[PDB]
Design a protein around this nucleic acid. Structure first.
Ligand code: ZN
Ligand code: ZN
Ligand code: ZN
Ligand code: ZN
Lengths: 231, 231, 231, 231
DNA sequence: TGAGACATGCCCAGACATGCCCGTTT
DNA sequence: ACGGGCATGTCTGGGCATGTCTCAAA
């Protein structure tokens, strides 16, 4: 079974938010909106902001899980490479197989589901600190997005979800994460192969569309991309 | 007896949906909008969606059984060549003789009717989560649609039924499959054969777009339209 | 264990000889000396000549065995593809797994060694028929040099050997065989990629060789290829 | 404890020999007379010849062991990386953790010396088949020479040794290994960086040659000799 | 540390490979 | 009865991907 990744703000307008990269511990963790992807170094900290309109009811929790992005791999549980699964790199509260880890919260709980066989981590929801309108959370990924025996270069996706005391869904969101050794580089590169997927390709193509009422449906459809593009 | 490929939605809405993606020569899957055919590689994952209207009673199961579309052999069991049939992989819960399997679903069941010796698989039916509005089971075909001493190029058609808790009918639909090597290829090419095979008649509407795949999906997203005027 | 393929005429000057192709059942079996390779169709007859100086002692036998040509494959026994291993295409005297078969000799014996696990066939040595100075023998190969589960396109090598009553070696020889569906074609093609491996490549390269006495060793060495080439 | 590598021909003039393969990135194994190094891909065949002036006593054995080359790690037992170790390969006759395996020899024995803890495999010595004047033996290296949590990019040295019935040293020789994914390329480079690092001292005669493949062949014959006057 | 410059495992668009199915000549 | 397109599985050199080492400048 492959858990959903469908965005769903729920009745609390739950959604995620990230920070920029170019100061202190930034090159060791950068986010590119154009890709909605987080580039980060093995075992280094990645901060994430939880935004919510109203306020979650008592007992509310926040969970984080990973699924592969590509379809031929989804059904495959995202484990940790074997080499690393055998290392003292564990605060103690978190099992060695788990890829994702919450940093700085002894209230965090790790789960290795009996049925789905999926790996996840949960923490009690906490209200924003007076001043800011979000609750930042810290994550750490324990294997490179290219370890053999592990993810094996298969792009992964992190699904953050807001569940109630009973576990029921209340809101969901997600983002792509690539663990590596040169976040800055890999980000540029990828932001480049994109800034080269629009210019490099410019040729035009036509299409025959029968139906007076149908043409206006494709017209107003394509007349829409003509705006959100040249800008 | 012989299984019917009658497009029987049922009284709930047991239909089919497939992911819209490119058709370059490097992908493992790619659907035939037109021919309702599939082009997944050997042993790769096949994402099959299942929309509906009303939730069937607590027990409805889904099943998969293959059939050769060609009238000549449309009465012969769809097995595996003794080669791969003599091969066991990471799956100690799914017989080597069966063609179709489901990925991640320990609730699955593979059986050969003691009357038809038919290869079929039945996996429990789960309803859509909160937010989303459908469900997709992950199928995996274990043999090329051209392996000598088996299917042997004989085109096929997967019959996905929605039989209730007592094996009785309650929904059904099907689609063609082509376990080939370059899914993009035998999709770019097995498609043009229906893009020069006839000239036809009619007066469309002129509408040109932009983009390579951006459009390759656009003109592609032009087939699912006029199909509501014949059968 | 990979049996030897080292040519060895022995004390009887044992060696092999073939015929030309371009008459009757020729296109269904051709030999190209430039390659010392026999191109032949599945299940069709291939004739081979056994030449020997003196005359083998009483009890002498002749064996034929196949080994893969490429090194990463030698250690692999040359079996028959699974599809074919299950067919009535057997005179009865010869097991279905065996690739090589002697045609027209009920005195022939097939072996499936207990240790080497190799497949072989043997026949009592017979003197030339008055007139010719050789003993022709007939072979048949029961799988295409490209059957999956079988040789799988891996080039094979046939080692004919002259053993005594006890089994001791007395002479050995060998030749390359490719089973296919278009011997003529495949032969030309290959005789072409060769007639294109000498002309296509002509550039010269130099080499520094210290040692007065050593230079004359490479001189008389290369001064040798200058003769057997332009001719 | 660290085993000796000091060559030792012994009273039977024991020493190894290798084939003469090329460098196309399609080769799976390829030795270097220059570097006296083998470049084989993961789990592929590496034939090693065994020459001996006189035949050994009844019971003589050949044992092959690996050692890290570098003085720093020369005391660290060579094991398979965590990943490949957790893979039971179609060779249940051999320990899942042994780096070196032998192919096609049921009489082979794998070892885990209690004291030293080193790993090695042994096989009974076999006299050269008539006509031939040496014995080859087939090995496989179950792990790239850079698996992490394994050799981890550390060069190793395989020490073939000839021991007797009562395991006494009889002779010994060795060679360098590297398990890649491009034995062709990797060797070209490594061989090239030597074919530049040295200038040597002397008077060199000049010999022009025709043909890249042929030239490369002499060049090899010549670099091998240029080693027969170094160490 | 920040940017090259390697090192070394792997993708791949574009050929090649190889069994066949026509159709038509010596 | 041997040259010709054809349906399909597959090889391959040129390039790309991804961790890590190395030297000079805030
Ligand atoms: Zn790892
Ligand atoms: Zn098959
Ligand atoms: Zn076969
Ligand atoms: Zn390994």
């Amino acid at each position: 079974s492959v858990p959903s990744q469908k965005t769903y703000q729920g009745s609390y307008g739950f959604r995620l938010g990230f920070l920029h990269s170019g100061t202190a511990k930034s090159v060791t963790c950068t986010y590119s909106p154009a890709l909605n992807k987080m580039f980060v170094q093995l075992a280094k900290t990645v901060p994430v902001q939880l935004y919510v309109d109203s306020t979650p009811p008592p007992g509310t929790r926040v969970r984080a899980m990973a699924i592969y992005k590509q379809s031929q791999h989804m059904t495959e549980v995202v484990r940790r490479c074997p080499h690393h699964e055998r290392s003292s790199d564990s605060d103690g509260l978190a099992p060695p197989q788990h890829l994702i880890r919450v940093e700085g919260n002894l209230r965090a709980e790790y789960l290795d589901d009996p049925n789905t066989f999926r790996h996840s981590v949960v923490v009690p929801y906490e209200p924003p600190e007076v001043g800011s309108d979000y609750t930042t959370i810290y994550f750490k990924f324990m294997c490179n997005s290219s370890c053999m025996g592990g993810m094996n270069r298969r792009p992964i996706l992190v699904i953050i979800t807001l569940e109630d005391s009973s576990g029921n869904l209340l809101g969901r969101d997600s983002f792509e994460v690539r663990v590596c050794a040169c976040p800055g580089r890999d980000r540029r590169t990828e932001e480049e192969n994109l800034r080269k997927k629009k210019t490099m390709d410019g040729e035009y193509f036509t299409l025959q569309i029968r139906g007076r009422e149908r043409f206006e449906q494709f017209r107003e459809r394509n007349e829409a991309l003509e705006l959100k593009d040249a800008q």
